[PDB]
Design a protein that fits this description.
Layout: H1 11-32, H2 38-41, E1 50-54, E2 71-77, E3 83-89
Antiparallel strand pairs: 1-3, 2-3
Amino acid sequence: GSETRTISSTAQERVDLEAVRLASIVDSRLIGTGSVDEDFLREQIRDARYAVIRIPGQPVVEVGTKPTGDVLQGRATGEEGETVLVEEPR
């Protein structure tokens, strides 16, 4: 039969703001040189375990370590039309 579960508006909310903060640092890199690298984003996390990149026309970057599935996901859209994702332990 059917089941209930407990959603977050605290731990799952905070990962959004730090993902918009990285959409802001990635814009500074798209203006700065035009591509992000893992060694640029490991200095910008500041709250998260892992940062993740979806910029059109360049390959995916993943910072820190790959997550298992028991993780929170923060997500943003940047100012040159890119996408940023952030991952934290659940």
